[PDB]
Amino acid sequence: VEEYDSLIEKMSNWNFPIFELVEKMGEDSGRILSQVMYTLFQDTGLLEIFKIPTQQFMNYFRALENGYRDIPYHNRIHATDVLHAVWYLTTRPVPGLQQIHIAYISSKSCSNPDESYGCLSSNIPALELMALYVAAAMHDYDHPGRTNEFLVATNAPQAVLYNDRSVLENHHAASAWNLYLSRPEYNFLLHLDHVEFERFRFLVIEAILATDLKKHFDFLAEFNAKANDVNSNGIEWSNENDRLLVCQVCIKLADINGPAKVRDLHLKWTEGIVNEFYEQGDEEANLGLPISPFMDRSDPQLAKLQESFITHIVGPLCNSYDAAGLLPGQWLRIFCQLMHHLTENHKIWKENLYF
Amino acid sequence: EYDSLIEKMSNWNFPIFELVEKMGEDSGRILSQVMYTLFQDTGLLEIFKIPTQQFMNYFRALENGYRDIPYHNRIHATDVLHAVWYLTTRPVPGLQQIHNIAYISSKSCSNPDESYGCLSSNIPALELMALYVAAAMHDYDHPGRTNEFLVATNAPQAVLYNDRSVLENHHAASAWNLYLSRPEYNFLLHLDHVEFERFRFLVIEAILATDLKKHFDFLAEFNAKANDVNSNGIEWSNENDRLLVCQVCIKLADINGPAKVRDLHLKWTEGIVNEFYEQGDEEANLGLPISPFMDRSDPQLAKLQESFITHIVGPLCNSYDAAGLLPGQWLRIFCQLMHHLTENHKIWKENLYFQ
Numbered sequence: 001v002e003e004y005d006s007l008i009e010k011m012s013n014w015n016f017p018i019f020e021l022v023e024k025m026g027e028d029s030g031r032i033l034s035q036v037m038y039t040l041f042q043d044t045g046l047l048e049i050f051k052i053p054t055q056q057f058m059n060y061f062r063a064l065e066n067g068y069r070d071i072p073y074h075n076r077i078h079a080t081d082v083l084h085a086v087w088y089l090t091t092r093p094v095p096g097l098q099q100i101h102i103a104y105i106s107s108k109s110c111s112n113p114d115e116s117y118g119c120l121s122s123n124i125p126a127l128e129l130m131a132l133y134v135a136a137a138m139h140d141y142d143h144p145g146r147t148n149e150f151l152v153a154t155n156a157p158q159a160v161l162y163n164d165r166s167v168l169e170n171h172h173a174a175s176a177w178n179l180y181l182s183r184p185e186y187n188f189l190l191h192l193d194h195v196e197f198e199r200f201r202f203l204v205i206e207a208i209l210a211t212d213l214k215k216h217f218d219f220l221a222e223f224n225a226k227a228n229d230v231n232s233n234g235i236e237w238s239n240e241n242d243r244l245l246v247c248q249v250c251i252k253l254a255d256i257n258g259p260a261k262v263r264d265l266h267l268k269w270t271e272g273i274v275n276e277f278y279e280q281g282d283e284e285a286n287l288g289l290p291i292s293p294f295m296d297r298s299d300p301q302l303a304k305l306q307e308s309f310i311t312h313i314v315g316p317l318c319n320s321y322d323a324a325g326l327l328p329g330q331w332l333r334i335f336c337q338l339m340h341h342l343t344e345n346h347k348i349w350k351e352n353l354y355f
Numbered sequence: 356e357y358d359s360l361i362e363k364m365s366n367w368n369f370p371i372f373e374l375v376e377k378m379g380e381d382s383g384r385i386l387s388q389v390m391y392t393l394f395q396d397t398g399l400l401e402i403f404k405i406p407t408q409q410f411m412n413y414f415r416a417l418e419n420g421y422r423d424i425p426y427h428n429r430i431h432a433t434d435v436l437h438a439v440w441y442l443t444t445r446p447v448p449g450l451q452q453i454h455n456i457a458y459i460s461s462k463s464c465s466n467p468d469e470s471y472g473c474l475s476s477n478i479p480a481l482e483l484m485a486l487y488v489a490a491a492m493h494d495y496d497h498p499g500r501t502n503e504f505l506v507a508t509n510a511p512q513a514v515l516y517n518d519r520s521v522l523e524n525h526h527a528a529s530a531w532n533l534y535l536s537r538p539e540y541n542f543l544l545h546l547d548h549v550e551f552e553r554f555r556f557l558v559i560e561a562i563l564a565t566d567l568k569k570h571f572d573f574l575a576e577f578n579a580k581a582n583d584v585n586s587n588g589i590e591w592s593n594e595n596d597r598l599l600v601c602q603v604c605i606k607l608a609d610i611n612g613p614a615k616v617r618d619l620h621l622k623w624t625e626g627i628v629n630e631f632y633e634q635g636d637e638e639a640n641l642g643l644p645i646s647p648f649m650d651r652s653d654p655q656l657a658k659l660q661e662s663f664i665t666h667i668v669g670p671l672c673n674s675y676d677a678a679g680l681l682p683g684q685w686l687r688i689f690c691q692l693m694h695h696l697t698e699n700h701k702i703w704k705e706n707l708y709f710q
């Protein structure tokens with residue numbers, strides 16, 4: 001209860017210094033995702049709204065956590081960071097977004113300054129935002145630190161099992177749900193009815209499956225058509241598919257936040273993913289496979305990787321989200337914190353490349 | 356045996372149940388024998404230098420993976436394989452030829468003249484083999500339940516595949532898993548990494564197209580390309596246009612019954628309802644709502660047949676026929692299975708309206 005208010009205050013910062021929390025937990029850093037999950041459901045009130053008994057909640061997420069491996073990047077910490085991002089993006093105030101309001105959540109840890117500000121929490125039903133948060137928690141569960149391309153190339157059992165389509169992302173969702181159903185001391189959704197649960201599950205899976213970057217430009221196209229058509233009105237908040245698509249793009253952005261954060265955090269995350277890349281290159285080399293781009297430890301091209309990734313993947317996504325007026329910011333023109341971070345970071349790396 | 360069979364199968368209404376009966380004790384080998392026969396007829400054995408031993412090893416395994424169930428069995432698999440072969444080889448009125456990169460011709464007929472074309476002339480041999488192999492696999496290890504049943508009951512397969520195309524993913528996944536499960540099966544040993552990778556892709560795409568939840572999606576996409584009056588139809592040079600044609604081809608092959616002689620249509624109908632009723636029997640036992648048309652003690656057999664021919668089969672055949680891809684002959688044009696389809700559609704409309 002003392003600890004609760006300490007943490008919720010730290011996480012109200014977009015640049016939540018998570019690695020300090022991992023260090024502060026030291027010995028019990030393995031429980032980071034379960035503690036943050038609890039904290040955020042309390043903050044959003046999702047516990048009271050769906051009458052979630054704490055024992056099972058904690059049972060499940062404690063299991064989920066342990067399903068994340070001890071690997072540089074695709075671990076409990078990443079899962080937690082992404083969960084934070086989606087929560088922040090869906091709760092915090094957005095300039096010029098209409099409010100509207102089947103239950104809906106509010107973050108106890110802030111009210112919309114005025115009526116010129118809206119929250120996604122006001123426009124997306126609580127059931128749907130819970131899916132997104134739970135999806136964030138699961139989205140990389142039991143990730144083996146290899147890419148889809150690697151698994152397909154090597155005809156890995158998983159790759160065969162899923163016919164080479166969204167191999168990891170299907171496995172994340174499948175083994176996560178398999179866990180949830182694997183014992184009754186996990187069924188924290190016991191107070192949702194058949195239809196609510198069916199739907200919840202659907203929404204979670206769609207959210208997880210959207211994190212595959214092979215589908216990146218497809219998702220991005222579909223979103224600009226709906227949201228960023230100049231002759232259309234953007235997002236019909238009343239429409240089921242328009243709401244899902246918003247959440248899909250939200251988690252997509254949450255999953256790759258680093259370049260839109262302070263350098264300190266961006267670089268820590270970078271360190272993690274390349275270390276995971278190099279382990280894969282090490283294995284590729286051993287099996288006599290062509291070493292994937294930017295995975296040859298004896299040739300980083302770290303500037304080229306960062307710039308390419310910001311330019312081709314992160315940049316266009318954030319601009320679509322920003323153009324659609326869905327990014328939390330404040331009035332002056334509008335100041336969008338992570339668009340500043342993204343631009344500052346994009347410039348630093350353009351610089352290291354050119355010179 | 357060879358010349359006997361190939362002559363019988365040159366009939367669109369190939370009387371398969373006679374062949375199953377004629378094979379009697381060796382009726383379990385029907386799919387492997389027909390597979391062999393048709394690759395010989397098309398010359399696919401010589402073109403990809405396929406060693407018979409492994410070919411037969413694999414397909415004999417594949418056969419055994421088909422269960423002893425009313426409808427989704429080796430016989431259905433064989434029927435569908437026949438349909439795709441017939442549709443892709445036989446002469447099509449008014450279709451341009453192009454190449455008759457390897458292409459096949461059926462030893463068991465030449466285009467009567469230059470006013471006739473074959474699909475075999477317009478789709479590469481690699482791609483048509485995928486289709487045929489896909490037909491063979493397309494229902495492998497089918498448990499005689501619907502996707503909706505497996506999803507409803509949170510069956511392990513349904514969880515494994517996150518409720519998307521559950522059976523169709525399993526058909527392709529466990530089929531390929533078998534092919535790779537021992538080297539005495541590798542009949543494609545003379546394709547290079549790229550050719551094989553691609554072949555596999557094409558096979559899976561073909562199998563996954565047989566999910567009827569994607570029916571209206573596939574149907575839309577096809578009429579857009581093929582039957583647009585302001586577009587120039589099918590670019591036979593284009594990879595995606597050719598795949599889509601094969602997808603629609605197998606789609607149509609999987610549900611051919613209504614476009615066959617009433618004798619055959621009704622035999623197939625008998626099979627599927629017997630499979631339906633076994634599922635209803637189980638639904639009843641688990642205290643689940645019995646799915647439409649699955650309560651043996653209440654067939655509504657006319658309503659099922661009429662609905663299915665009108666809403667699923669009818670529109671598909673008309674799209675294929677409008678796009679001028681159906682084998683037929685000049686007079687106007689007589690399309691045999693359009694006649695069958697219409698006569699059958701009328702007989703069922705009649706049993707409904709009147710009885």
Ligand SMILES: [C]OC1=[C]C2=C([C]=[C]1)C(O[C])=[C]C(C(=O)[N]C1=[C]C(C(=O)N([C])[C]C3=[C][C]=[C][C]=[C]3)=[C]C([B]([O])=O)=[C]1)=N2
Nearest residue numbers: 140147213214255256257258259266269270273305306309
């Ligand atoms: C959150 O903070 C950051 C996250 C960063 C990052 C920097 C900060 C970064 O700097 C260059 C790179 C990545 C990155 O590559 N993540 C990632 C990649 C793939 C993958 O699919 N790869 C490498 C093939 C691919 C690349 C481009 C397009 C398609 C495929 C799968 C997963 B995952 O979590 O499952 C995650 N993430």
Ligand SMILES: [C]OC1=[C]C2=C([C]=[C]1)C(O[C])=[C]C(C(=O)[N]C1=[C]C(C(=O)N([C])[C]C3=[C][C]=[C][C]=[C]3)=[C]C([B]([O])=O)=[C]1)=N2
Nearest residue numbers: 427501522567609610611612613620623624627659660663
């Ligand atoms: C080859 O010749 C014939 C084939 C016939 C047929 C008559 C002749 C027939 O008469 C009623 C019905 C069927 C049929 O239903 N096949 C089938 C259906 C579904 C399915 O998805 N069902 C039942 C829900 C559904 C029904 C209609 C529309 C959408 C969904 C899954 C699979 B399978 O193999 O997995 C196979 N096939």
Ligand SMILES: [Mg+2]
Nearest residue numbers: 139140168211
């Ligand atoms: Mg991932």
Ligand SMILES: [Mg+2]
Nearest residue numbers: 078140211255
């Ligand atoms: Mg991730």
Ligand SMILES: [Mg+2]
Nearest residue numbers: 493494522565
């Ligand atoms: Mg099927």
Ligand SMILES: [Mg+2]
Nearest residue numbers: 431493494609
């Ligand atoms: Mg079938």
